[PDB]
């Protein structure tokens, strides 16, 4: 029995690790028979603070990291008489009396479609010329 309900099939342990499957209220589970425990924030150390002592590095390393950022998605357009009527005269006549609903949908879709292209252009077009190595 935990604070988020209860688990069946898992065995509680007294240890603590940087877990991978969240459960809730601090409790989380892992495989290692499935076990459940309390997650550990990390290794604990104490810096030897004083009032006349420092720590100056003597060597260095250079690391290259990566990050990924999406910029745009697919541009889509949707018809109405094809979709909600499927080329039927009676359906078209009945739909005709619902005012102008599809115009707003087409306008919004066109707006987002233009926004995607403007977004990509502003993201990538940062130079005025084309340099060559």
């Amino acid at each position: 029995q935990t604070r988020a309900g209860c688990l069946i099939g898992a065995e509680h342990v007294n240890n603590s690790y940087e877990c991978d499957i969240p459960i809730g209220a601090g409790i989380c589970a892992s495989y290692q028979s499935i076990i459940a425990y309390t997650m550990s924030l990390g290794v604990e150390n104490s810096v030897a603070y004083s009032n006349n002592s420092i720590a100056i590095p003597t060597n260095f390393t250079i690391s290259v990291t990566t990050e990924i950022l999406p910029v745009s998605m697919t541009k889509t357009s949707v018809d109405c008489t094809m979709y909600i009527c499927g080329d039927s005269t009676e359906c078209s006549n009945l739909l005709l009396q619902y005012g102008s609903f599809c115009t707003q949908l087409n306008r919004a879709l066109t707006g987002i479609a233009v926004e995607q292209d403007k977004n990509t252009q502003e993201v990538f077009a940062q130079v005025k010329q084309i340099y060559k190595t």
């Binding site: 357009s77 018809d79 094809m82 080329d87």
Partner: protein, 49 residues
Amino acid sequence: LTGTGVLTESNKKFLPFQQFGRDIADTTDAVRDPQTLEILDITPCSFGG
């Protein structure tokens, strides 16, 4: 089975007890004629803005 489209020849194989097939989202893709018993193919004819 009623609907519009263009009919072409298809090489897909049907088990001897089916009558028509579909791919996904329950949309007809191929049909077998009840007379000559051959597998045709249905394609929506072109449209656009």
